[PDB]
Amino acid sequence: RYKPDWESLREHTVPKWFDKAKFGIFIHWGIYSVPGWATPTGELGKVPMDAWFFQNPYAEWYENSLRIKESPTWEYHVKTYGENFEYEKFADLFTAEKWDPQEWADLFKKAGAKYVIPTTKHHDGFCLWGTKYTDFNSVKRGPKRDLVGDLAKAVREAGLRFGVYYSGGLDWRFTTEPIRYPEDLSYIRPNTYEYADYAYKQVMELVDLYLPDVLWNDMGWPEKGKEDLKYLFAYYYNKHPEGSVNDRWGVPHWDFKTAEYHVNYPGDLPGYKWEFTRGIGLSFGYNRNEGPEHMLSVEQLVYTLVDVVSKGGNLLLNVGPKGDGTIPDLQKERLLGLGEWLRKYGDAIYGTSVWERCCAKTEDGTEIRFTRKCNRIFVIFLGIPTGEKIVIEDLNLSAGTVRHFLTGERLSFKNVGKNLEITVPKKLLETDSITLVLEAVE
Amino acid sequence: RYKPDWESLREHTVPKWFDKAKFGIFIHWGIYSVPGWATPTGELGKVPMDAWFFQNPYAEWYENSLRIKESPTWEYHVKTYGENFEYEKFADLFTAEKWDPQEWADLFKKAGAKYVIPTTKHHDGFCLWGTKYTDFNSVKRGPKRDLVGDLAKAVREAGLRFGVYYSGGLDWRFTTEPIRYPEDLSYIRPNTYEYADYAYKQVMELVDLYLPDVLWNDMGWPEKGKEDLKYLFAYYYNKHPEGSVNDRWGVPHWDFKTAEYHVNYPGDLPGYKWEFTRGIGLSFGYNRNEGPEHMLSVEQLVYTLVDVVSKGGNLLLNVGPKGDGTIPDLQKERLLGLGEWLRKYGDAIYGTSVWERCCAKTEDGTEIRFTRKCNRIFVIFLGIPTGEKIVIEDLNLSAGTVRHFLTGERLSFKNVGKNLEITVPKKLLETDSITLVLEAVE
Amino acid sequence: RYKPDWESLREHTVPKWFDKAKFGIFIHWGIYSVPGWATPTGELGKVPMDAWFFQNPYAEWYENSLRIKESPTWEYHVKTYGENFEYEKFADLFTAEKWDPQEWADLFKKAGAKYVIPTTKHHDGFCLWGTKYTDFNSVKRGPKRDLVGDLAKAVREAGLRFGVYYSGGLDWRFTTEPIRYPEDLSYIRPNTYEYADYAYKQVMELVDLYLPDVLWNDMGWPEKGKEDLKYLFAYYYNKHPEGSVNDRWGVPHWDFKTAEYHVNYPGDLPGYKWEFTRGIGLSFGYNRNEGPEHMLSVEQLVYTLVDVVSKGGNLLLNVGPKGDGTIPDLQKERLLGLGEWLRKYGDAIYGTSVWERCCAKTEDGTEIRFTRKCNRIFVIFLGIPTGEKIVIEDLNLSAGTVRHFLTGERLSFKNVGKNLEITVPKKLLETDSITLVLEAVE
Amino acid sequence: RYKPDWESLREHTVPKWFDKAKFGIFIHWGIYSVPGWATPTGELGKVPMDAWFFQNPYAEWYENSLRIKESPTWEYHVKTYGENFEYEKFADLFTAEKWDPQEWADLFKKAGAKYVIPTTKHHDGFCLWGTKYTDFNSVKRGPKRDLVGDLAKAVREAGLRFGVYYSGGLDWRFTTEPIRYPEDLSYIRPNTYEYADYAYKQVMELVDLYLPDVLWNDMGWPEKGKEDLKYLFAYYYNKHPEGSVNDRWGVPHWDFKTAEYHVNYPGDLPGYKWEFTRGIGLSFGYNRNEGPEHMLSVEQLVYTLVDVVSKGGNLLLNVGPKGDGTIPDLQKERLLGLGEWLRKYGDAIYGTSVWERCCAKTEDGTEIRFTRKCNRIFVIFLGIPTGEKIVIEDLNLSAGTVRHFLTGERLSFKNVGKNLEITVPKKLLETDSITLVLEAVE
Ligand SMILES: CC(=O)NC[C@H]1N[C@@H](C)[C@@H](O)[C@@H](O)[C@@H]1O
Ligand SMILES: CC(=O)NC[C@H]1N[C@@H](C)[C@@H](O)[C@@H](O)[C@@H]1O
Ligand SMILES: CC(=O)NC[C@H]1N[C@@H](C)[C@@H](O)[C@@H](O)[C@@H]1O
Ligand SMILES: CC(=O)NC[C@H]1N[C@@H](C)[C@@H](O)[C@@H](O)[C@@H]1O
């Protein structure tokens, strides 16, 4: 038994399955999916924060944007729906008419994901399960259905892990003024004891109804309720020792840390487990305004995954479904490309560990990443080099044998001074898909 | 006026009437009284705590037991009521069809009790008064009646003090998981600010409606509400200076401490006022599974009372009535035996004080207890010795006169070394009921 | 054992010996006894606090008054000792050349006192024992003798209980500014962590070196050190269960409360143990400026002790010795006359308890006080009535036998309406000393 | 950098080197080594705590036992050294005249230890380095040498990791009363702000002077100083990321947990890093009263290390040197036999990981332990089976090749039901030392 106290909770570390899975699908789906609109400004971390909330690229932030009169969202909303059309009205238009949880789960498995995490309640406070603490939920309005539970049954039947996302730090059903600048976040929150109970009661409810594999909180936890987390974490781990929690609660305990777009992204091995998340585009919620120019290409997806895993992280790729429950083609296609790549190269990803260094580069500038499986070291090039002569800067090996990963063909190499030289027969080079991958054995 | 602060509340000590009363009746009555069932495993303090909650002898813990699938209670419940029969359904079958508060009060007075304390809300959260904070109460469900108030009017008319018991530390209407081990108690509680208000509002309600003589809390008080107790105690004492509170709140203040079965039972004079409680059997709530083999015999009751009073305590004997409001015969009979004994010997009990030592024994092993009334010392044998020659080990007296209590007959004695010898004419010995009692005067 | 927490410390209550002792001697002696000077302005509680610190009648406040320039003390010091004579210089004049502790203990025993409490350190911070935590003490300076130790031995030898007074709240060795108004006390204090450790250590030292029967703190305890008291009190009681503690610490626990001159004086029975304290004159420290007109007369002292005792308290009468270790004649005379009355009527004071009411008055206004001893009720007249017929207003008796206390002579009485009438033969009235004492027996 | 807050410090986890090291030497050496005496009553966890401090088998508790008069230690001290010989006087006898640190480091390296942790200050408060915060240290008294420093250099020279033990929780230089029951520990502690600064400063000093690989605190950290730990740990890790900290601080952070004799010993895999600690006999300090009957045999030591290691821990074996700086022969002999077994089987211990289960047993009860190295699984018998046919209960294998570890000889096996059967030729069995070791490869 874990006791409700931080020294005791410390005993729980990130479970094996989370560390070994290296890819998960995040799903931001909610009534905001109906208007599905946002100005695709840029990535978090590179857009100046004095403009960010005013031209918010995160479509799930639609209601906050709508509350800022004279903001692209406002003008858009009025022109499209009218002024006499409140944001909550979207809960009624959120009908998930074409939703099929099993087709969703099939897709995530084909994409190579090993876990899934849907938003059970986002900042707008709309709940996707039949909670007994609010009527603003999917059983009573719109879909007339328990979205979280139905998706959980499907995910689990497809053999994948199931976690839940909850916006504990923000709930627009409890505030009126929108966030215009980062500083507003320090005082524009529910703030009441009522809200702290509520968040607690709702996460306890999700633990009792679905016993999620991951508790993914966002935006910190209500100051008044932080001490509650000792009990909730103890309660959770005693029912599910293989469960886990992220680092956005703002308390002493967490099993893995998180980075979002440019924010808190590590340039090298961090020394603790973490997970990277971002959308396929610039939004988490569906944005009908995004074109492929705003999205990662399958190749960049592969590169992102590789960089992440070589640094000890997991990638939590987000998909943003439509109000009718379908996944936009641009996203579905990218997911499949990635799934294809993972089918060929997955053995140098899943179940791997970090090596001594995560990164390297060739004399010509192609970047490289490493992953380990005992005595096996995988060398992953972010691209496929043209010349059969490959020079890796600042690297030597006491291996003795280096194979071309996909064919298994023994290759010739030698440490030439501070570098390492390997010859890769263009026949092999041409067999690789987005990344040249070699396996070295020490 | 007492101010709402511990240094000030300290000014209030256990009132005279509580110290002088030495016997009270506890009443655990609730919807759990309907199924009235528990495996009579043994006494608290002697049953291993890794099995205790799984074969709980406390029938009022029926709902907790029911929540542990595959527990005797579960198997029993399913076989008798069925799976589709929730615990709350018992509030509707709790009809107190044959209840007569005055007959209850008559009985407690005949038994020699000077105060009474019914459970107003037990761990299952069902309330026995028409509280305005919950519908799960006896006015709205089952008895369709204010049980607490009606019993209070009857007790008070019979001339006895009236207190109330409240389960502040536990409320199963606010949790889902049952207690399986002692450690669970540290995190499986309401935990919310809502619950802390609720407990406060409900005890304030009982103070305003019935101004009880004793506030008997159980299982500690919600951490979030501890500071509230400064105000509630001040409020209470300023309306009733002769009121009192027990020690199960977990705050700096209390008027008297408590011991339950083997738990915290003193082996000698403690040095502060306390009260002992236990059932006539092994349960507090009615257990149709208990036979006389599980209950104290009138003689053991008398002994328990005597040991307790000689150590400065009060005995709070519990009776567990049936769903129809009647008191099982096995319990009624024991109560009357005790009442009979108190009629003869009461003057060496009520209004007494502890002496220099509480205990002694005869050369043959019969145990003895002392009580005082100024210059009068009562000597109470836990049994009636056969020989007319009685030898008390490790005791001397500078009295000069020793009388046989019931007849008042001057007896012959002398301090023989480290012992004391008294001759008790078998005519007298044979006049005593369960205890030989002598009175010495210094 | 007692634990270091308020809930557990609550268990300790005022010891029997303190309760039964009814009189103790307070001794304020220190380097302030050398100048031994103050403006005897009036009693505490009757002098407006806007003038108090400027015309302070407490001679032990000399250093504080000295720091307020243009203060009678200031003018007096400069003409007597000079501007360049620092207060601290008095430790070198404090020689106690004529001190004889056994003579003191003897006088206190003859005076009827059952315990003694000397100032071990007063507000000026000079310590009367060889503490290891400051050189400003009596073993290193002045007397070069452990006054506390020598006195503790002598009091004990005389068979008297010994306690210690400590100034936890003020220590002028840690401040520079004087106290000019009550408000100043809110911020002119040591304030440091260092001082809170210092006071804890010094009291621990007194407990270790002398295991006092009473820990009598004054002026509150440093806020930073308040939590330490749980630890200090548990330590103390664990070494000396029959030890006791007063109420001037500013924390939840205490064994008895205190009243000083008019400050906090009960008009009636309080409901808890307390003690009244005052000088024989208007100061605690020796004041050469006080004459008989500033002191209580033997008669007023007896009256005082009776009033207090009848209200459930102990009288802690103060003596203020000279710098040489002698006790001024005026003080001695009053102690001896009080001891003489206590030799006659001790039995109606020592070991008594409060009755139903503390007070009454005769038809022509002679005040009456009551005390108890089981069934014996003492009736103390604050003075001796001249007529033989005596009418006590608002008092009835259900005794049957009223005696004259000194002779035992049975007297004639009858309840006449809401009063009680009694005949006391002048030959008896003529035998009493300052109080007519009757003894009723119900 | 790590920040001074628990959320950030969580990032630091037990370093790789500690995890891989599997054995370390603890050294309890101090002025208590001079009397070097204790009643070897039994193992911690098996001696009732009502007698423990009165018959303490931990010789380094000598000062505490000495303060309990009429204690075997007390009687022994008075007949040997005399009533007037204060404990502190041992610092003058503590001369370490025959000490040779390189000889110690050498013995620890031969014994198979990969790290060393000496007592820098034990409960008696005497410091084995020239601290600037107390004169009661080894540079000023006794040896007049920096023992910690000299030992740190020697251990490092021998290629071993060096950590420090510090008694944060107890320091008998700040108390006067002994510990007689566990409960006493709740209040007999330094308690001051001064001591909390002292302990922080002393540990900061150890970090500054020696940058230890392990900070091993004992007995909790002063409550007043707990917040300081955030600052101290951030400081430490920022200077030495590969440094580590144990779990005896009473705060949220720690890198590895600890078990002592029976206290906190896991019956199975724990799920976190931990370390078992014990003396070779029943004491940590040298005890002249212990003979071979109180010590572990080489065989039991090997068994111990294997059990621990298979459960994921490190064994921290204690040595207790004499006052002269020599290590008793009995101790030395056991260290050398253990080093001899480690020279043979080191490869199945060092740098291993836990397997699926830690344990198993043969059909006739020989206990079995498992450890791992990638695909290689070590099978360690706690003893050498006499027959050649060996039956492991409840174990199946999916390897295909099991070898004899010392020879490499491939052996014959088959899964027979819920068991595994194997033939080990006696010529092989005859080559093993205390343990039969098999190596399976799946
Ligand atoms: C860095 C941060 O606090 N982000 C909050 C952000 N998290 C994303 C995964 C989305 O759910 C956004 O809606 C949310 O504001
Ligand atoms: C020792 C303790 O905390 N007991 C709680 C216990 N008190 C009894 C008098 C009954 O009311 C039980 O139902 C309750 O759990
Ligand atoms: C009411 C109060 O706080 N009095 C403090 C007062 N106590 C007396 C016994 C003397 O020691 C004075 O010097 C002290 O200031
Ligand atoms: C379980 C515990 O708190 N043990 C304290 C104990 N630790 C040992 C390694 C020795 O240093 C003992 O002296 C110390 O009291």
UniProtKB/TrEMBL annotation, chains A, B, C, D:
Keywords carried by this UniProt record: Glycosidase, Hydrolase, Signal
GO biological process: fucose metabolic process; glycoside catabolic process
UniProt xrefs under Pfam families: Alpha_L_fucos
InterPro entries named in the record: FUC_metazoa-typ, GH, Glyco_hydro_29, Glyco_hydro_29_N, Glyco_hydro_b
GO MF, any single term: alpha-L-fucosidase activity
Gene3D superfamilies cross-referenced by the UniProt entry: Glycosidases, Golgi alpha-mannosidase II
SMART domains cross-referenced by the UniProt entry: Alpha_L_fucos
Domain of life, per lineage: Bacteria
Keyword Signal: yes
UniProt keyword annotation of Signal present: yes
Record-listed E.C. numbers: 3.2.1.51
Cysteines joined through disulfide linkages: C358-C359
A GO CC annotation given for this chain: lysosome
SUPFAM superfamilies per the UniProt record, alphabetical: (Trans)glycosidases (SSF51445), Glycosyl hydrolase domain (SSF51011)
Residue span, Glycoside hydrolase family 29 N-terminal domain: 1-347
Residue(s) carrying N6-carboxylysine: K332
Described function: Alpha-L-fucosidase is responsible for hydrolyzing the alpha-1,6-linked fucose joined to the reducing-end N-acetylglucosamine of the carbohydrate moieties of glycoproteins.
The family this protein is said to belong to: Belongs to the glycosyl hydrolase 29 family.
Name listed for the protein in its UniProt record: alpha-L-fucosidase
